[PDB]
Structure formats: C-alpha cells, structure tokens
Symmetry: D2
Subunit: 509 residues, 4 copies
C-alpha cells in the first residue's frame, strides 16, 4: 500500500487477521473478574492493565483485588519468555454526585416514566427511600449551582430531568428521558459550576493507599484544570513520584482547558459518554480526534474509555456498531482501550477481553503507518538532543530494512516511549530490569515490554548482548520475526550513559 486509498481497497475480510494487536487493553476488575482463576484467563486473553474503581468498595476490598491480580500475573513468571507484565491502576472517586438507595423490598428498580414528575431532595430521611416521587442525592450545595430550566442526568446519562421549580432542599423536575433508576447512581450537571474540590478528603486517603499498595498509575477523575493535576501530584508526593497520572477529561471545562491539563499530566483518558452529556453529542467525535491527536503529537499516552462493548454486560458478543466505535477509536490514534462494566460486573468478562483483542487486532489492518510517522517527524521540533535523533532514525530504519522490531534497552522506559511517539509499524520490544517500568510501558502504543530477571554481567557489552538475545528469543517465540530478518537495537554507549544514543542494525540469528 503506497497510498492510503490502496490500503483500504486491499482489505480482505476473508483472509485471517495476520497482523498482531498493537494497543493496550485496560480492564476494570470487580465482582465478576476478581478471582485468581478468572484474572489468569483475562491475562492470557490480553489484559495489560488492571483498573480498580475506588468509587466503590473499601480499601480492604481493593487490597485483596490487587493481591489476586498479582497472584494471577506471577503464575506465568515460571516462563520469563512468555511472561507478560500486568499493571495496576487506581481510579479516583473524584467530585461525585450520587443518588440514594431505592425504597423497600424486591428489585432495586423504579420505572421513571417519560414526562412524569420527580422531587430531588437533600432530606436524609429519604436517603434510602428513592422512588418515582422523591429522589435523594449527596450534593448538599445542589440548589445554589443549578437554575430553573437546567438539565440533570442520571446513571451514565440514561435518564434526564429538567428543573421546573427551585427550593431550599427540594428541586421539582420533569423526567425528559425514561429508564430504570437503580440504587446509588452517578449524577451530572452540565454547565453547572460544581463547587466540590479536586481532591476530596476521601481521594487523599485513596491516593495514599495507592502509594502504599505500589500502583503503577492513577486515573484522576473530573480533571478541570492544571492545578487539579498538581494537587493529585502533591498527594502522591515524593514516595509515589514515579506513579503516572492519567487525567480524565469528563466535562466541558476539561475540554476547554485541555492543553494545560495535557502539559501537566503524564497521560489522558477521554471519557466519551461523560462528554456526550456535558457537550453536544454530534461534536464528541471531533473532541475525541482532537484530544487523541494532541496526545500523539505531545507523545503522551491517551486512553479511550466508556461505551466500548457495554452490550457484553449481558451478551456473549458485541453489536456491529460497538465494534466500529472501538475500531475507529484505535485508528483515531488511541494508545489503549478501556473496558468498564463489560469486565467489572458483567455476565461475560472473559469474552469481553477476547473481543476487545479481536477488534483491536482487526483495526491494525486498517492502520496506514507510513503517513503517521512522516507527519509526526515533520511536526517534531528539530532538536539535536541525541536520544530524539536516534529514536527518529530507528523508526526511519524500521520501515526501510523491513524491520521485524526495534529493541530498546531501557531502565525507566523513557527511551522506548520516545521511539513509540513516532509510530513505527514494527513492534517496540522494551527490555527492562525495572518491573514497574515493564508494567507502565503498556500505556504506549506498540511497546511490547519484557522483564530481564538475570542480574548484571560485569562486561557491559555482554550484558547488552544477553538482553538483546532475550528479546530475540521472545520475538522469535511471539512470531514477530524469524532467522534472517533484521532488527534495530537501541542502547546507551558505556554503563553510566545519560543518552540512549546507539543504533545498531542486527540480523536475527
């Protein structure tokens, strides 16, 4: 395919999906995916990062989830060629409006009827007496920020309401969109100024527990401005300074102030459904393409979250439209896809992981790599910093000497990230001794991390050759290349080296 149009006209749907998957998979662990035996099966089927939603459960609960994730992860360590690192991600509650419990016995489900009437109250007598008439919620200051004629959304926006009359505690609304109101659901107020903090007293505890439990990354919720990110940084502090902060863009202020949030964060998560409420639905696809685009250019990773395969909560296979939606998010240029209820609580957590792999595998057929790189090279600011210079040449060479891989010997990952910024077709095999580095690597597109566990041989160049040989074995075993192919190898020069400034064209023996 010398042209993008010819790359589309070749697309044969009957020939098998030969290209391997190249984007991270993030699964939300919960009730249906929390056992060691399941986690094992999800790790095999492609889970790369375990997401823990601290909107629910106690610290005790999550500690066990984390312990199970690692138990399952390390079950495969007895073969260091096929062992895959799995990361752990702490996802903050944030500023969150939630409803109360549904009243009485039986099913926790009231049918909110289209056009009907609904009183929103702050009277804690109704705290667990939610029904068709009255609805409690936890935002105490709600009557000050919200006005007459304002929209209110409930349960990832399934239900919508319009404020008809205000009060001290009561707010009288008319139910515009119907649905089944469940217990304790999430409540958005588009174009309200929610006076809640960036880091609640709870979030401060949850983040300290994150540091304690040695998490790899924080998914910081309802990020509105740069100073919100810096408050998350401070709480993680000195001890958790190498934990990656992914800011979640969930509202309008988020999108408007995006550039400052990106420059302050380690990466970005685009919550499409939350935006879909706070912004006009017809415009979210541009928001997604803009944010993913800017992140590709800045070389920070970006995740697509919400509304991926939600039909697999109840079904063993997704819809046509969900498959298209996910795939276009991969082509847009996302680094990872994130499953939520699909894996957390759904009836088919294992099949959700396998389809997310299937879809992300197919999308790579549609990706036209040479354009992504040439554009990213031309927009790159012309530094003669040796590492960036070498990363470019490595990718450039990866297309020419038809390369099967780019092998990066990297301690912190930084070098492997600088190569990935430029979007090579070839897999980037990041060889690291630091296991956190190996775990964090999954956030980047096309990095395949491996963990070298033999400790260091005195002779520098031998240590290097041993690690390269490890990556050669892994690659051969993964099908990435076979004897007679050629790979690129980035290293330092000498053992104290500041730069990864050494490019080396190596035939696979």
């Amino acid at each position: 395919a010398d042209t993008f149009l010819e790359h589309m006209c070749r697309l044969d749907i009957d020939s098998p999906p030969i290209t391997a998957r190249n984007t991270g998979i993030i699964c939300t662990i919960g009730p249906a995916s929390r056992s060691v035996e399941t986690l094992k099966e999800m790790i095999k089927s492609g889970m790369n990062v375990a997401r823990l939603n601290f909107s629910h459960g106690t610290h005790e609960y999550h500690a066990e989830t984390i312990k199970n994730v690692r138990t399952a992860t390390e079950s495969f360590a007895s073969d260091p060629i096929l062992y895959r690192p799995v990361a752990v991600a702490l996802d903050t509650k944030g500023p969150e409006i939630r409803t109360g419990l549904i009243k009485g016995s039986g099913t926790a489900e009231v049918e909110l009827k289209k056009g009907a009437t609904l009183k929103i109250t702050l009277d804690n007598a109704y705290m667990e007496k939610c029904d068709e008439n009255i609805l409690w919620l936890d935002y105490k200051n709600i009557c000050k920020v919200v006005e007459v004629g304002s929209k209110i959304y409930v349960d990832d926006g399934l239900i919508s309401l319009q404020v008809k009359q205000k009060g001290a505690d009561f707010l009288v609304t008319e139910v515009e969109n119907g649905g089944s109101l469940g217990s304790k659901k999430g409540v958005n107020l588009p174009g309200a100024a929610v006076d809640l903090p960036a880091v609640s007293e709870k979030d401060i505890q949850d983040l300290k527990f994150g540091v304690e439990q040695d998490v790899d990354m924080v998914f910081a919720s309802f990020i509105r401005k740069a100073s919100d990110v810096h408050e998350v940084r401070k709480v993680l502090g000195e001890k958790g300074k190498n934990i990656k902060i992914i800011s979640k863009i969930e509202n309008h202020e988020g999108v408007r102030r995006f550039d400052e949030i990106l420059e302050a964060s380690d990466g970005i998560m685009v919550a499409r459904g939350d935006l879909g409420i706070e912004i006009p639905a017809e415009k979210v696809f541009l928001a997604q393409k803009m944010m993913i685009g800017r992140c590709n250019r800045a070389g920070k990773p970006v995740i697509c979250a919400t509304q991926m395969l939600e039909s697999m909560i109840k079904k063993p296979r997704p819809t046509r439209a969900e498959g298209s939606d996910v795939a276009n998010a991969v082509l847009d240029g996302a680094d990872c896809i994130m499953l939520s209820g699909e894996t957390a609580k759904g009836d088919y957590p294992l099949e959700a992981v396998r389809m997310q792999h299937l879809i992300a595998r197919e999308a790579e057929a549609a990706i036209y790599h040479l354009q992504l790189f040439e554009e990213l090279r031309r927009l790159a600011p012309i530094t003669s910093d040796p590492t960036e210079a070498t990363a470019v040449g490595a990718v450039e060479a990866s297309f020419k000497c038809c390369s099967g891989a780019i092998i990066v010997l990297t301690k912190s990952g930084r070098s492997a990230h600088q190569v990935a910024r430029y979007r090579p077709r070839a897999p980037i095999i990041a060889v690291t001794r630091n296991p956190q580095t190996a775990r964090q690597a999954h956030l980047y597109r096309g990095i395949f991390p491996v963990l070298c566990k033999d400790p260091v041989q005195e002779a520098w160049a031998e240590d290097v050759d041993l690690r390269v040989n490890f990556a050669m074995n892994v690659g051969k075993a993964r099908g990435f290349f076979k004897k007679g192919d050629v790979v690129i190898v980035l290293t330092g020069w000498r053992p104290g080296s500041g730069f990864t400034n050494t490019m080396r064209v190596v035939p696979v023996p």
Copy 2:
C-alpha cells in the same frame, strides 16, 4: 494543516461549523414524513433524495407518496436560483432464491412508469443479479441508476464484479452485521467505500445511522460518531431509515444528519484524497479525464471557489467529483433527471437551467456560466473577484467536455 495530524489537532469544537455540508442526504419517506408540509420542511433542512421502501405498501400508496414529494419539491421552483432538485429512489423488496422476484418485476415496471431516478436493488449477490435488474428496467428506464445493496457474505466476497456492473453501491451495515462477524463489518465498510471512491462510482451508507431518533429529538454520542466516521471513510451519501419514515421526529433527524455531515467536513483532509486518487488514476489521454484532472488540480492552486461543469448527462461532473476537490462542483444541466441523479455524488451541487437555448453557442454557454455564478454568489460559495474553473465542450454537439477556463467571478 500541511499534515493530517495537524488537521486533527486544530479541531476546535467551540467555533461554529463554518464549512458547508458536502455529502448527499437520503431520507426514507413513510407515515411520518409523507405529507406535503413535512416534505417541504425536510427539503429545506437538506433532503436530497426521497427513498421509497417497496418492502411495504401498495403501488397506489407509493404513487401518492411520490406525487407528494414532487408537489413539495416544486413549491420552491418559483426561484430557480434557490431551487434544489430532489430525487426519487425505488427500493426493491428483494428475495426474502432468484434476483428479481415476480413482485420485484412489477415494482420495477412501476418505477419506470413513475419516472424514478434510481433503484436500490436489494440482496445483490453477484454481477448477473445486477444485469437482471437492468433488463427488467429495460429500454425505457435505461438511464435509471442501479445502486446495488451489499447485504450478505456472498455480496462482500464478489464485490468487485458487483461494483463493475452497478452504477453505485449501498453498504447496509446492519444486514452485514448479521451475515458477517460484527468485529469485521467496519473493515468491509472501509473497503467498499474505498473501492467505490477509486472506481469513481457513488457509495451510500445505510442502516443504523440515527435510529435512536425514532423516539428522541437528538441522537446518542455513538450514533453521531458512527455517521461522521462513515463520511470520513469516504461515503458520498448517508441514508436515514425509520428515523424519517415512521419516527416521532422526522424533521429533527434530517437536521442532525445535516449537522453531523457538516462537522465531518472539518475533519476531512482534502489534498491527500486528491493526490492519491490522481496517482492511482490510469494515464488515459481521453480529453475529458485529462481536463477533469487539471480542473481539480487548478481548483487547489488558484484558490478556487468552485468548479462549474456544463453537463447534459452529468458524466462530466461525475469525472471531476471522482478526484475529490475541496471546492464545490456546480453541475449546470438542462436535463432535470441529470440534476436529480447528481446528488449521489459527493461535492456535486446541481443546478437546473430553465432559460431555453440561445442560437449562438458561446452565448448559451456564458448564460449558463452566469447562472452558476449567481447561484454561487447567493449560496456564499464565492464573491466578486474570486476565481472559478469552468468546464465546457468546444463547439455545439461536442463529444468531449474538453475545455477548461479560468474565470474571475464578475
């Protein structure tokens, strides 16, 4: 935007949708959209082609629907600068087997009788299926366009023969979604749209566009993305089904489909589409193709506001559209069927010249060009002092549209 990535990083969601819409809109007429007053409002809000689903209703029923469509369409004819052609499309029942059922043979003959512009032929499996539809339409309906619908696996596998036999293609995503693995349909769509762009035949995306607007006044986030990605994939038209046929908000469905298709043009990166299509084009020295290329080429350089094509059958205007200019292609035609059929192509804006013919050839030409100049000015496409490209024949009755002319807007 010198790069495609920089074209995405510029995308400001707060600034209004300044670029005008460039892809056809096809609406399915039925119970909720069948009155003249509604049709009127849908035509204003952007309907370009009326689709009649002959899976349901009697011939008598549809005859009235068609008559209402035309009544509404012609309400605007009293201003020939702002009059917009509206097309009629007959959509077969199909096998539910042979390619043309005893019913379909009747329905197609009724199509010819009613002077439809295009047939959406269902469950097209192979090339010989298309040719059977052609034969039934026969001599009298020989200028009716056949859009083959790809609805099953055999359809996708044998696509190249179906495309080479058809006037255009419709990709029914939901039908494929059943017959094919769900995870693969998006590739099918990108392949089929791709091949059609290259062959220069039009392609339509149908089913599962804004189906939530059957009951709701606004679509979902995911529907909006789905439609928009179909436009970027490179579709020429989008087709609404239940949204407009029977739903509670037929008029708002048309307006959103316009809104979405308007926003998608911001995301389109035009210079790449053209340069790729030029490089893949087989080096003919057929004068019309040679001129169509140069016209598009010039449309980028002399920052052109339009390409005006004087075309009787449309063929010339289609050859320009194959090459995907950013500029609007104003197809000026005296044939009203040509003006109606034009909507199938992306970025063709057809206009209908009703002034009769002046004896002096070059005067007739200048009068038509001046008509397009007026329409363009009035539509905001360009203003005085801009430059447009003008394709014409050379001499009367000419076989080629082989005359390119760089004209300042007066």
Copy 3:
C-alpha cells in the same frame, strides 16, 4: 528516467540525437556571412536571429546587411508551413576603450614580448603609430581611474600589462603576457571604475537607426546598473517601445548589481570572456549558473555569448572542450547560444552554424525536464491571474496526456512566453499574425513560432480553429506529432478578452 542520475546512466552515445533542438541560435553577421546565398544556407541550417555588431561598420554598411538578411529570410515565405521567422539584433558599441593603428606599411602586427616595456600615451601624434615602444588608446581619463601596479588587458585579453609609473598622458607598463598586437583592439581595466557614460553620442545615433531599420532587439553593451537600461529605453522611446532590450553583463559592477539590471531589462546576455577578464576566471562558471538561473526564474530570456566555437574561425570542426562548454551552457538553462567570429569573419561560417545545432541537439538528451518544471512551479509566486494559472495547467497537462505540443494563439507573444517560463518538454507552437512577435519569440527556449498570413474571419471561433489547424499542419509536417496524438491549445475566450485563459485538450485530426 524517474531520477536525474538514471537520466545520465541511460545516455547512449551510439544511438542518434533523436530529440530535436530546443534552444535559439544567434549568429553574428559580417564579411563571411553577409551575402544572400550564405544567409539562405545559415537560415536552413538553423540561424534564428541575425546579430549586427555596431562596434564596426557605418550605418550604410549595416542597412545593406539587414536588407540581405531579409531578402534571404523571405526567400522561404512562398511556403508558409515551412517558413521560419528570422530576427535582427542591433548590438551597441557601448563605452569602449580601444587602441590605435599599428605604425607604417606592411604587416599590421607588432610582437609584444614577455617581460618587455610599453608606454601607453594619449598624445594623438601616436594615434596611428602603435608599436613595441608606444601604444595609443582612446580613453582620455585613463590616468585617473588606474593606479600603480594595476592590470591592463588587450584584444579579448590576449595581452596583459602592469602599470609601473603613472603620468598626465604617459603610463609606463611591463608586458606580463605576450602576443601579436593588431590595430584598434579592445582594452579592459579590471576593477577600475570607467567614468564613461551609458549611452555615448554614437550609441544614441545607432539606436535611432535601429528603430528606423525595424530591428527586433538591442543587445546593450557594458550594462552596469538599472539606470543604464532605462537610458537605452528612453532613446528607443515611443516608436521602438516593443523592441526588446537584452542587457549584456560584461564586468564586475554588472554582476554585483545583476538583480536590478534583470528587473529593468527584457533579457540578459552573459559575456563569459569579458567577465573572465573583469572577474577571477575560477568564479565565472558560478556567475553564469547564477545569472542563467535567476533569468529562468524571472522568466526572461538569457543568452550565452563569446568563447563558444572560436576554433572554427580556422577549422571545419570544434575542439572537444568547446563542445562541452556549449553543451553545459545549454544545460545550465540558457535560452539561446550566440556565435561571434565563428560566423562573422571565419573561414567556415556555415559549418559553425551546423555544429552549434548539433551540440544544442545533443544537450537536449542530457536535459531532465520534469525537475525543471516542478521546481519552477513551486518557486512561482501564487497569483490567481488567469493567464499564469492556465499556463501552469497547460504545462502540467503536457507531461500527463503525453503531449506532442502546446499551441498558443498569441498576438504579442506574452502568453507563449508565460508557458515557456515553466519549461515543458513539448514544443510550444506560438501562432501569431504579428511578424515581429514571431521574430522575437526565438529568444525563448522551446518556443517554435509560426506566422499566420490568412486574414481574419469575422466569426471568432472559426478564426481560432483556422489558426489551430495551421499549427496542426506545421506540427505534422515538422514531425512534432501525427494523427491520433493529443495536443494542448491555449486561446482567449471571446474576441475582446484580456487573458489567454482557455485550455483545450485536442486530439490531432
């Protein structure tokens, strides 16, 4: 040849010069080429412009030369398909330092001996008494501009001298380079500021005679600055306002101030030998490539003059090095080559014209056209002037629909020149009714002018079709194309049209 290097590696010296010649030939008429029968044979063999050197001869003499040129030219008019226009060029004397006559009877030749002594004097007693001791010359102010240790050159620089002592009239010099000093020869003063005017009392007469005789172009000598060109323009004045001024660059000031001279002139002539004296020899080749380059970009024509085939004054065939020198001047991007003594006075004027055609024919094999055009298009300032827009598209189309020609219907030539600026491979057939336009066309590279003599039909489009058909006949007859080929045709739209804004792809009937 997709690359320029592959265009060189293809160059087969055994296969004949298949490509037709595409650059103008200018011959200097004089003693050996002044008869009608010779001029006839030179016109057949390829002369396109007759050059008359007004450094010598009276007005009466030249009037006859001009009359002979036209007699010979029009001999071929009895077939308007094969008739070729021939232009006439008046070449000014300029500010000129010259020596006196050699003393006495007999041989007009004194042997200036290497290292010897030579007095330069202004005493008109010695005006026709030049010898080994004393040498008269015509520059009265020579003692003011020249200093002790200064170089002085004589007779196209064959002889060189160094100033040892100054005086009022006398200047005592030491003869550095030897040779045979003849009568009245040319005397350069490198890095002197020669205080002479731009248009001498003589040049004013010669230019008025030019207008009188209906010349097509003036080759203005010793052009130093823009204001010198404008003085030549004023003298030619209203009546001779369509006579083209070619400025000759002959000295250092010329090269330094080139951009203003080019912007003021209709075209440029690069006198390599004259520069070779005023400038360091090793730098002239860069000057030539710069000046030719700038002229190609400005779209004004440029001529290479002096030191082409000078060995053919005495010999029937040139040297290897002369052939290379000429050919590289064509590849540099010159529009015309100019022969001097070779044709003016030499023993083989006819063979000099035929070799100059042979060489210029071979050079077109080495020319790589697609690069010239693509570069010239990218550097062209993005006007939306309809004529430039159409000229570009015409050339663009000339490569694609493998075109045999670009036919331009042009009254003044301007349209045909705008096409030629962009360097198509295809011949540009300029069809004009103005015979001066047809003559002046030869200054441009790749314009093949033809003169339509059928008078005008009232119907515009018929007139147009008749002219197009004339060019079709000429092209067929010249071998440029045959039936079934495709050509491009530029015209106006309507008879009052300002622009040549109509491009038309026409199969050859």
Copy 4:
C-alpha cells in the same frame, strides 16, 4: 535551497568560498615536481595522490621519485592531527595488441615491490583486460586498487563490464575526443561518471584540465569551467598531467585546481544527489549498508558537522560516501594504505591513528573518536557543542560497521 534553481539563484560570487574542497586532487610527478621541497609545497597546497607515468623513465628513476614523495609526505608526520596521507599511483604504458605487454608485467611487479596504492591501467578495452591486470598484481598486490582508463570506443561501448571488473574508472577526455566524435564526449563523461556514482566506485577525470598552466601562472576562463563541470558531473578526483609534471608553474597548478574544486562545491546541490542515490540503491538489509544510509540521512537532519567512520579497510567509509553526504566523512584508520587509498572517494577526509591499541575495546573506540574530534575541531569542520555521527563495529573483530551513534562534540 529547497530547489536546485534556488541553489543557483543564491550563488554569490562576492562572498568568500566558505565551503571546503571535497574532491581528490591527483598530480603527475615529473621533472618539475620531483624534488622533496616542491612535493612538500604541493602536499600543503592539496595534492592527495602522486601519479607516476611509466610510459617514460626507468625503474631506478621512479624508485627515487617514490622515495622523494614519501620523504616529503612524512615531513608532516611530526603532527598527527595535521598529517595528511599522500597516495602513490602507478600508471601503465599500455599497448602503443595485448592488454598487458611484457613491459607492463615488469612495471606492475615493480608497483607491488614499491607498495603503490593504485594502478591506472591504460587502454582498457574489455573486462578480461582488467582480470589480466589483476592476476599480474596477484596475491601480494591484491589490495592495490585497479582504475581502468577508458581511452577509446571499445572502452565506452563495453563500459559496464569494465566497471563491474575494476575498482574504479578514469575518463581520459582527450583520448576519447580522438576516438569518438568531439560533440559526444561530454555525454560520455556524464554517463560514465553517473554510472560510477551509482555503482559506488570512484571515478577520475583526466587530461585537458589546466594545460595552459604549463606556461602560465593562471588558467583560462574555459579551463576553469571545464574542471568545475567535471566536479558537478559527479567526479571523485581531478587529475593534472603536464601542468604539474613538467610545466613552469607546478605549484600554482595545484593551488588553482584546489580553488576551482572549492568553488564547484558552492554549486553542488547535495540533498538531490543523496535522495536519488538512496532510491536507486537495491534494498538490502545487510547491516552495514543500512547503517551507512541512516548515517547520511541523519547527517542532514541533526545538521551534522561530520560522519566519523572507524574503518580498517575503508570499505565502511566508502559505503557512506556512495550516498554523497554534504558533511565531511572522517575515515579513522590504523592501516596507512587504507588512509592513502581513501582519497579516491569524494568527501572522505582520511586520518591515520598512530596511538597503539588499548585492550578495552570501547576505550580504543573512544580514543579514535576523540582523535577525529580533535582533527575536525582543528580543521574547522566543527566546534564544541556541534553534533556528529559516529559509525563503529559492535564487539572487537566485528564484520559489520553496524553501530550509529549521535555524539555531541566535547
């Protein structure tokens, strides 16, 4: 200069010749240039290779010439930063018939005995002529480079086989000028130089360069143009004959040949030479070629002051030069024959490391790199804070030069 035409329109003749000379200079030693004191002055002024014409003189005569060349050459060795290698070239009599006359067999064996770097083999007609010269030089002189001289028509016709058999080519313009039509020789020259650039073997231009300097201290305008166009054509070295061998101004001939070749580099447009040579290169994934490409590619981007190649045989430094970087190629070698032979290639600046080997491989490497850094700084090629590219092997005894390293100048 983004375009070649803009590279010509910039050419300022008043600003000094800032770019350094980049093509080898070969001088013919003889009566007027045979003394140690002269040779010294020619080496300073830029002689890179001494040519000995075995058409005349006895073996005894030449032995002394060679001994004088080396005496003069090594006078500068007392500063290994500024020491420049000088090569010796044996130029056969040839047939004046078989390819190797009984004389030539003796002269070539004497060449091997005297440790010459290259043979200029005369009147080469076909490939089998080259192989006979190879056999005579044999095992002991197997690393002596054979430059075939093209002097006649058979030579030009059969050129491709001669090039594929030879180490390099010499184009004798005057000899061709007799055997071929004068008007065609310039094409022959451009063809042969072109093919040699593409094959990556070196090519020399000989005869009719500055012949007027036999008697005069300065050349003609036309000689200067002739030489300069030979450099732009793409020659690697220029060769002076009588100018330096017997003429009255041998030293000034060398200085002008430097002056001209210095000016020609202003006119050279490098980015085109490289991109063309890369696109025509057969896409091997042999690690050395892969790295040579990337090195040149990087040399334009990280605006590099040099490409430093640690090379034992030169082969690596030659593979970089094939691709025509603007940057100087500093070939660092311990083999003095390698350093001498390097001058045949365009843009290689060889240096001779005389410090012996440190046991630690990477230290040895760093010491050589540091030597080239010192040389470059001292030659003005770059200063502290610039960035250079460094090619090396990976372990000791490595077969590939497969290690590219972007290094700031300390």
